[model samples]
Target: GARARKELRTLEASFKGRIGAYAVDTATGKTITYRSGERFPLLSTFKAIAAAAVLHKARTSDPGLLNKVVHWTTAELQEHSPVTGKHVKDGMTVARLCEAAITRSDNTAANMLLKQIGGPAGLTAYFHTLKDPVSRLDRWETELNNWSPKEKRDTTTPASMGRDLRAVTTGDALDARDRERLNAWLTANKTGDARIRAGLPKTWTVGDKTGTNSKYGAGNDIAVVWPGKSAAPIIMSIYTNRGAADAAVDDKVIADTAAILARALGKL
Candidate 1:
């Protein structure tokens, strides 16, 4: 126990910025928190939560909600959206938007989902049902290049995000099928290869969501890691921000935390 904490301290010291993480054991429901309950600037990380909320709505009320097609004009085309802005010739479905948001980290897709769900407050209301809800998500990421926690833009606590990961992994919010599909989307995540997946074992399977804003120097990677096909899951929420440090440092925070967690779980 003492060795784990000491190693975490050493890992934190490796970064000049604020770095903290929380890992929860699925079978035991035991948690290890490095920064005690620090909240981080949740950039694109909220997209996964948004997707879950929308899936919940679809499962509970209208099953066609996810397949419903919606149109977005050029005015709504956000700048940082790499996938949706360039390729959306016709209107896209809620399913398409969610995929782009998760796989491509497309802000336009995330923005559309945000609008459909009635903005950050709408998702916040849904998230409040969780035992540990995220603090708030107010903006639509219009100017992701120029963003921060200043003026209450967007934020999430490590514990809250961890709880969310737990919810999805344990099938709390969305239906079993939707939750499985969400996990599939996360498994194919194209972004954030350098964060939590760095230095990980080849046999392990990780379904994760990453939120990164290098301009403001923020990084967050949350995931449900299966150490092995038969091993129990490990929920990891690693967040680092507010420094002019290298992105690699933030990544190391995640990589090393995973290593410690894997070994601690006796699945390494």
Candidate 2:
């Protein structure tokens, strides 16, 4: 316990900006939360919810839907490729679009899915069902055609996000099959080199999604920790904003923070 606290303190001291950390034990419903409870910008992590919403709607409107085709306009292609400056053709399927949105954080993919799911109105409507009201989706970028940064719209908190992830993982939000599919997509979308993933052993299986906004220098990591048969899985979220330093330094702060938390919780 002492070692864990010491490590946490070390992590806190290392951070140059505001940090928030949260973890939930699914079995016991126990949670550890730090920092403000108010909403923060979700960044690309909202893709998880977007993916879920699409599937949820699909199950209702078009059950057994598998990669239904949807044409991508030049506007959509341009928006999606703004970051990379690439122009992809239209006629991509719903499944493929969702995949690209979540896995690659492709702005075009997200906009296409957002349109299919009823745009900003639909996302906001869906977020109301979340356990935390702070986690609602508000606006989208007209130029980029994606979700706006936190400062530009409503926010989401780490605690609320952890609950959302727990619900998705435990089959509490939808049917078992749908839940499984959602988990799979979320797992595949996970691609951040810092925070929880970096702290754990290479052998451990981690399922997670990360979010960052270059403008605000915000970074977030939400992950499911699978320690194999020896331990029960854990869900964790780490967020930092107004970082006291550059991206590289803030990343180290998050990585060390996760290490301390995992060690404290006996997850490592």
Candidate 3:
């Protein structure tokens, strides 16, 4: 069930600037949307796609892909944000690379995986197969020296990305084995704190990805919630592009948003 209009209004009043949110009850497939259709810059969340692409390639060519070696060069060590960096050595296994990219939100690991999975070209091809035109993978650091100062690179709507995640979880886009692998990987991913994680009940198990790019005034969190042993789960994505603000302020915004949505959606 969606929150009442008055409740949404009260939530909106608490925010100092613009915000966007999306939540779905997986058990019943019911969704609540507030500016969920808007397109926003994707930050580390793009790693989720990178994770999918890597698994897609791994399943087709290297069934035993986890053990394969993935060497890292000095060039692949560039850093974009605080969470990811280049100081670490390369030559990790495919499984580790995927894990680092998803868990630690490692930029180096992500770029390397992007290259191995056919770069932006490959990701674009896979996106097309899913018929998701709203999502774009136009730039890859391996190909492009750096992000353009004037250009906005990757863009996606919460609905589209949520659908992609849903596809992965339901085995609609991937096979049963692959879906299970994705679930395991996402579940093990170590990035969570004030966003979707804050909204979830203590009894629920949640899996998700978070993305943030300081330059674009953006930050995002996407999560799949499984209430204990329940077969059904909820998928939620919240993206915000509020103007310049400190980390504390941003975190407060996300936490507040989650509080509102969680109360509105009720338990699955």
Candidate 4:
């Protein structure tokens, strides 16, 4: 355990960036952390939590929530909203919005879901209920990706994110059907090809969310992975933010760091 932490630290140093990584053995409640308590920008990774919150509401209080339709004008669209930007004319259901946000990381879709659950403040409030005081969202899509070492607007600690992700998907945070929905969306996530997934063996199934802001050399990936068939899940969050003077974000850094974790965890 100690050795894994050491390797993670060394990896951070080699990349010339700050890294906050946390991993958990869901079956044992054991954990590994490296700068996990420290803050790191959430980027689009907030969409998974937003999607979970909406699913939580749908399961708990609003029975037909996901079926509800939402219509938005072009003004509401944000950059990188591939899925939602195309569906604006026809509008989309809440369930479809969640899919777009989680699987496609669509900005317009995320904003719509955030609005449905009440803005950034509402998502933070939802986290409070999840007992995750360290994770917070203060801005909507594009703007929230603005990250700086000096600023801490929309951020999450690695430990908090991993724990909460495990809770929602495998613990008692959400109903079985809702959790299934959340996991399905994450399993279909398309934006993380060269990150954590690239570092792991194909035998293991992975459900993940990725966030990136190349301008600031920042990239993040959080995942719920099954070691193999009939195996318990391992939850992990890896976030990297390059120094202002460093080159554009490197997917390899994240991949290599994940490989370290996989080996350390005896998966490699």
| Candidate with maximal lDDT | 4
User: lDDT per model, in order?
Assistant: 0.76, 0.67, 0.68, 0.88
* Model 2 lDDT at residue 267: 62
Q: Write the per-residue lDDT of candidate 2 for residues 1-268, one digit (tens) a residue.
A: 4565455555666554667777766766656667637456777777777877888788767764447766655654533344223435446667776677766677767777788778867877777665556676666643321223335464678877877777776646766877787677666764666667787777776677777765446778887777665667788878776542234425776777677666666666
Q: In model 3, what lDDT does residue 204 have? A: 72
Model 3 lDDT tens row, 89-156: 54777777777888888777777777776787677777776677777777764333222223455777
Which residue pairs show backbone clashes in model 1?
none
Residue range with the least summed lDDT across 10 consecutive positions in model 4 = 259-268
Q: Which regions in candidate 3 have their CA more than 4 angstroms from the true location?
A: 1-10, 61-64, 80-90, 141-152, 245-249
Higher TM-score: candidate 2 or 4? 4
For all predicted structures, in order, the TM-scores are 0.91, 0.84, 0.84, 0.97
Between candidates 1 and 2, name the one with more favorable TM-score.
Answer: 1
What is the C-alpha lDDT profile of model 1 across 1-268, one tens digit per residue? 4566777777767665676677888898778777747757777888888888888888887779999997877787886677677666788889988999998888889988887777878877867866555467876675532455453457777777988878976646777898898888888899868877774786778888988777546778898888887888888888777555334436666777777756655667
Model 2: residues with Cα > 4 Å off, grouped in runs:
1-10, 64-66, 78-87, 141-152, 243-249
Better of 1 and 3 by lDDT: 1
For model 4, residues 102-134, the per-residue Cα lDDT tens digits are 999999999999988889999999999899998
In model 3, residue pairs whose N, Cα or C atoms come closer than 3 Å (at least 3 residues apart or on different chains), thus clashing, are none
Query: After superposition on all CA atoms, how large is the RMSD of candidate 1?
Result: 2.3
